[PDB]
Symmetry: D4
Subunit: 121 residues, 8 copies
Amino acid sequence: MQDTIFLKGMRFYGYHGALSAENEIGQIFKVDVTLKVDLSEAGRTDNVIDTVHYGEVFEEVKSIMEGKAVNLLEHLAERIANRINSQYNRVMETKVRITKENPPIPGHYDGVGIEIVRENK
Amino acid sequence: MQDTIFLKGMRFYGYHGALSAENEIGQIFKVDVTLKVDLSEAGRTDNVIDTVHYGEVFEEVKSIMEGKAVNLLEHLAERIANRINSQYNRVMETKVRITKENPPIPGHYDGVGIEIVRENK
Amino acid sequence: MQDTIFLKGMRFYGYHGALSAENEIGQIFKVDVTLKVDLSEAGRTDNVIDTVHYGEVFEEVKSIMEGKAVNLLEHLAERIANRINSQYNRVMETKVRITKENPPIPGHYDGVGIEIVRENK
Amino acid sequence: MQDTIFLKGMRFYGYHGALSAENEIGQIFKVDVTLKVDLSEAGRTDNVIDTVHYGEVFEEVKSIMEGKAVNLLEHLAERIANRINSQYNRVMETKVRITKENPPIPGHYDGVGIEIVRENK
Amino acid sequence: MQDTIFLKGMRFYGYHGALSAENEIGQIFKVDVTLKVDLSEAGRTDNVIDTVHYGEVFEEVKSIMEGKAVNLLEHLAERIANRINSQYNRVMETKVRITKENPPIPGHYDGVGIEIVRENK
Amino acid sequence: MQDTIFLKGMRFYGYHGALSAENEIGQIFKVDVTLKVDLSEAGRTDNVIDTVHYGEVFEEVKSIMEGKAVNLLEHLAERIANRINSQYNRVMETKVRITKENPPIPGHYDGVGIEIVRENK
Amino acid sequence: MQDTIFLKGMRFYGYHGALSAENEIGQIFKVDVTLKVDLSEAGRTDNVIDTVHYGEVFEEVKSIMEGKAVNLLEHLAERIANRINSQYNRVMETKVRITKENPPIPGHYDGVGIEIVRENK
Amino acid sequence: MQDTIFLKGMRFYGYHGALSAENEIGQIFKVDVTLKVDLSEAGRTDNVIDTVHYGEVFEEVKSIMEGKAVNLLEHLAERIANRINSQYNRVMETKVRITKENPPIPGHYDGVGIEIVRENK
Ligand SMILES: Nc1nc(O)c2nn(-c3cccc(C(=O)O)c3)nc2n1
Ligand SMILES: Nc1nc(O)c2nn(-c3cccc(C(=O)O)c3)nc2n1
Ligand SMILES: Nc1nc(O)c2nn(-c3cccc(C(=O)O)c3)nc2n1
Ligand SMILES: Nc1nc(O)c2nn(-c3cccc(C(=O)O)c3)nc2n1
Ligand SMILES: Nc1nc(O)c2nn(-c3cccc(C(=O)O)c3)nc2n1
Ligand SMILES: Nc1nc(O)c2nn(-c3cccc(C(=O)O)c3)nc2n1
Ligand SMILES: Nc1nc(O)c2nn(-c3cccc(C(=O)O)c3)nc2n1
Ligand SMILES: Nc1nc(O)c2nn(-c3cccc(C(=O)O)c3)nc2n1
């Protein structure tokens, strides 16, 4: 089953980061969420109730990304994957990628971050 | 067999969407279609009749994307994959990705959508 | 005097638009604000009080762009230019460009909008 | 008066070109239309009737770009500028830029074309 | 073994295409070549003779892409893969992707093409 | 008169540069050529003979850019502007911009170069 | 005289900013430097000594951008323009644009900054 | 286990290359480093000590990329992968991609390079 639902390049201004200064100033966090979901039924029916509403997923991500500031992106992706797997039984597995495009790292690069894949139990 | 034929970033202005307002105003839909097809024979012959004409595939996609407005992208990708698998025996499997780059979702993101892979029976 | 202060590609999700459907669903609005300001004194002093804080300008723009929904972009740029010229005597003239990258217009284009230049009296 | 209304990156698939082959195969034409229009009244009123509807301009451009095939881009921009100046008294001057991003020219480049500015008499 | 050598976005102006008009006018062809090659020895030695010179591969591709005009991209990728596998024993397998970014297809899209993977025997 | 004919992002692989090493290895040169030409007549007639053929201009540029290696971009733009003004009486003035996107300068930047504007006498 | 020498998108990682946190963490600063210089002589001669070496200008910019941390971009552009006008008599005027693509401003935007133009006395 | 830590588009100006001229002039090298690391613990704890600090990895890469000039990219990726696997037991495997976007190859392309994947023993 290779069907997926996806939300790309979601950006939120937040205050997460292990450094005090980072928590103070804040920065933009880029998030990509890919959900493994069997889409044939919805493909047949055309009924929104046979799939996972992308609008509701974005809201879950947002609440976590624009909420209390944590230290790691690992913690942020872990709470997102957990929150999506929990509320949707149709999601067989959740992949969350978080990118810090402008971290306190003295150099020239496009971005830094992590990516986790969590199966829904 | 890893051979493929592909059509990338196909854009159509349509009126699909579960929301009334969406059906009224319309929006741009981005479509990516990848076909698993053994290309060696055509590679040997150089005869167009030994492969799948990308121009004809785009027309099939277009007719579905610029046609009657449905509610889901799942339904739109399902009719496309079904239409391509049906008319071409050479297509062993069809992958359709549809992106709503500007959905009625209050936020900052690059796009939202779905992707399905359908084997030709 | 060719000195300027600028804020580029500011994006806000709003509900402005002459169409009911637009007010209902909303869309992303891109804003570019260029201010004619003599920057030599601040260039000499390095004192933030000798110039116009970009952070405060963005807040003014934001309040107008994410506030009550109006019909025209002309009205939106007119309230922004007026609000910036009013609070900053150092701004000799204000230029506001607003882009609707995804308007209810059935077609393929990069964006549509307006640009106004308002001298501070 | 530096106020303008603009439509950027409008793309149409057409068959214009001095070469037979070009008229046969067709190609994508990129169009940028900038209109000099005093936007203060609409800025004050917020009444759509005090400005020029971008949606109607795009339709005029479209009809010309997706219509009968001519030889030059100069002829295409000349009919567009003439058509916009003619129907809108509020347009003090019209600028039309047309780009052939993929012309029958053996080389590596981003695009080729012309740009005309026509005052409304 | 996941080591590779790659040449991305190689562009050539050519006259391949099943349509007469295409052979007459020509167009830009984009090529991506990925070679599976064990790179540890060269990684240890730092001796150019322990790997495959990207400069020589580009020349092989070029000669095929800017040479006699054929009908299919399948034929073009097949001659490239065959030419690289043949001259380099170190290449365990060759992947060739060819894109027609501007084909005689009336529509809006990023590109069309094919991709083949050929193991070196 | 604000009419122009333009050729953007023309790229050529050359060996110009004041450094020996540069003449040896070569690099990509980006060229932008803008011609001031009254386009109304061609706009009226639709006759290619009433304007300046972009295809012929690109050839002139090419011959200069892919020809003998000189030291400066100033010399390269000067020979191009001179060559275009000379062969076309319709060109009232020629603007040539040349960019070295990858010069032997140890740093991070998008490009370096020059731009000249030459009136046709 | 419309001749210019330019250095675009120069990026440096620095610690300038009116906020303590900014001085602590640092960020990327984008710089664009345009010099008004008569390029005809160098265009005629092809002698590097008849123009301004872009490599030397980048070094001046770099030393200022990667040096002691100041509060304003105005101060940074003022020292750059002053340093270039001072060492080169051939530079009739210097334009310096500095962009903070990731400032401590809670929002979604492409960048913020200033631009100054300084004539060489 | 599909968890990863990544550093994308890291750019360094260096003097590696099999050609004398290349060692003399230097060029920009683009590096992408992907690390397979189990991120659940850090995801649970939010403790930086339960993961691999991206800032420290960038420093290791930098020291190798901006250090002594070698002939191959294979040698450069091999020393990076080896250096990261060596200092971090948490890294189960390291993938290093190096791109020469502007090599001494007479042609039009986006880039050339290699990619290696090295398991940590
Ligand atoms: N522009 C903008 N919009 C929002 O909705 C924001 N929410 N936060 C925000 C507030 C408090 C904490 C965080 C956080 O990421 O921890 C984010 N910054 C914003 N900026
Ligand atoms: N510009 C443009 N071109 C076309 O070919 C279009 N077809 N539709 C269209 C018409 C009716 C229904 C749909 C739909 O997607 O349901 C699309 N909008 C277009 N715009
Ligand atoms: N994501 C996001 N963030 C904000 O700060 C928003 N503000 N509005 C908003 C709310 C009410 C009216 C408007 C408007 O533009 O008229 C905008 N939508 C948002 N989405
Ligand atoms: N995809 C697409 N959509 C349209 O609305 C088109 N109109 N034409 C078209 C038809 C006849 C003549 C021309 C022309 O440009 O001369 C264009 N090609 C299209 N493709
Ligand atoms: N600009 C440019 N440079 C080259 O090296 C070219 N080679 N061909 C070319 C010539 C003959 C046949 C083909 C072909 O692709 O069949 C290509 N067009 C070029 N343009
Ligand atoms: N790929 C490619 N195509 C061409 O037409 C080229 N011409 N030159 C070339 C040859 C001799 C001198 C110069 C020069 O720029 O001085 C350029 N390199 C090329 N590469
Ligand atoms: N990667 C990198 N390279 C350099 O040359 C740097 N110079 N500085 C630097 C050091 C001290 C002060 C500043 C400053 O901008 O004030 C910058 N950070 C760098 N990072
Ligand atoms: N701008 C810039 N910044 C640095 O930190 C650099 N380090 N090197 C450098 C110096 C010596 C050898 C190499 C090399 O790559 O072999 C690189 N060039 C730089 N440019």
